[PDB]
Write a protein that binds this ligand. Structure first.
Ligand SMILES: CCCCCCCCCCCCCCCCCCCC(=O)O[C@H](COC(=O)CCCCCCCCCCCCCC)COP(=O)(O)OCCN
Lengths: 293, 53
């Protein structure tokens, strides 16, 4: 192997933990509260307490569910997040962003498998709703990526989707497509506007709620990791060369938009993605295609 | 006793009860003109890039 994997994984773990801390620090600031102060003094150590405590809690034996699939769902998500970040930072793959798109279509499996574990009639509909949201806004993400590839060419003039080459130049023409990429990124991370779960999940309709140990931990960590990956993609594609500050700022923007916007009903968000976002992304694609090379 | 909480002589100063309508600011036309200008600048940048490449 290579020493680079350590230099990628370790920063991701630290960053995700502080992402979780940031989420509440911002929400408190918006609501005239303060960042948690009983865990320590600086507050740097607040997430480690949660993770270490979650480790201590006594394991619960699985009930009325297949053991393999139950173990598989965390491994699948923890694999997709790692492969994504390590193909975003440590690879030269000509169609690397297309690979990231493929890796984002595989995030649907973890939710679906979690829903299957419940094996409840209500949970079957609830998981179908979540996966419907992910596939519906993944189609729009694919069209946006198509718009990204029309404007991205390498020095030798060969069309491609290399993250380094798309990052090298900042194109203001793509900004109309970056707004759609940002809305879709909110959808794929199940943020508040597209957060169908929370209303349905107050009762045990079905979700990752079942886990309550190292299994639940990875899911939440992966959620923030995916959100940060989307922020990185927004930076690399529409905002120039990769900047750590920009990735953090985009995450903060996600939290801000979350706070300021109410959630949508099932039909409403899906109607937005099919009859609003998709026609706009197709018009932007045809316009960019017609502008030419 | 004979001294109780009574309103001050002359009454309290007036307060505001009705809502304030603050819907002043940018409207649709300005956004359209700004978007049109930004798009034209983007098209010029695109053409320059497409030629240099
Ligand atoms: C008009 C100019 C003429 C030229 C023609 C060009 C046409 C526009 C092309 C420009 C490309 C940019 C478009 C921006 C995305 C908006 C998509 C269309 C707008 C729209 O339909 O409104 C709602 C979609 O926005 C939503 O409500 C999505 C949910 C938003 C939640 C999250 C928002 C995040 C913050 C916004 C992004 C900002 C990025 C950085 C903060 C639908 O709703 P509807 O039902 O009313 O429409 C149905 C009415 N029949």
């Amino acid at each position: 192997m290579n020493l680079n994997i350590i230099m990628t994984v370790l920063p991701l773990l630290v960053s995700v933990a502080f992402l979780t801390l940031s989420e509440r620090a911002v929400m408190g600031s918006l609501q005239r509260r303060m960042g948690p102060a009983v865990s320590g003094a600086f507050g740097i150590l607040q997430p480690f307490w949660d993770g270490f405590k979650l480790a201590v809690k006594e394991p619960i034996l699985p009930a009325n569910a297949a053991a393999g699939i139950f173990y598989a769902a965390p491994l699948i998500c923890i694999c997709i997040c790692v492969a994504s970040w390590c193909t975003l930072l440590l690879t030269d793959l000509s169609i690397g962003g297309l690979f990231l798109l493929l890796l984002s279509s595989l995030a649907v499996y973890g939710v679906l498998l979690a829903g299957y574990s419940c094996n409840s009639k209500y949970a079957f509909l609830g998981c179908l709703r979540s996966v419907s949201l992910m596939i519906s806004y993944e189609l729009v993400i694919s069209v946006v990526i198509l718009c990204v590839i029309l404007e991205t060419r390498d020095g030798n003039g060969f069309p491609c989707l290399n993250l380094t080459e798309t990052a090298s130049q900042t194109k203001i023409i793509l900004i109309p497509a970056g707004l759609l990429f940002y809305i879709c990124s909110l959808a794929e991370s199940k943020r508040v506007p597209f957060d169908l779960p929370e209303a349905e999940a107050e009762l045990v309709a079905g979700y990752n709620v079942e886990y309550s140990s190292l299994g639940f931990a990875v899911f939440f960590v992966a959620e923030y990791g995916n959100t940060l990956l989307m922020a990185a993609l927004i930076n690399i594609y529409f905002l120039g060369k990769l900047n750590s500050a920009l990735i953090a700022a985009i995450f903060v923007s996600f939290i801000w938009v979350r706070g300021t916007l109410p959630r949508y009903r099932y039909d409403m968000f899906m109607q937005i993605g099919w009859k609003s976002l998709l026609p706009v992304a197709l018009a932007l694609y045809l316009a960019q295609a017609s502008l030419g090379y | 006793p004979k001294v109780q909480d009574v309103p001050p002589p002359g009454g309290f100063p007036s307060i505001r009860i009705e809502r304030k309508l603050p819907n002043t600011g940018p409207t649709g036309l300005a956004v359209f003109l700004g978007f049109t200008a930004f798009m034209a600048l983007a098209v010029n940048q695109a053409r320059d890039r497409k030629s240099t490449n």
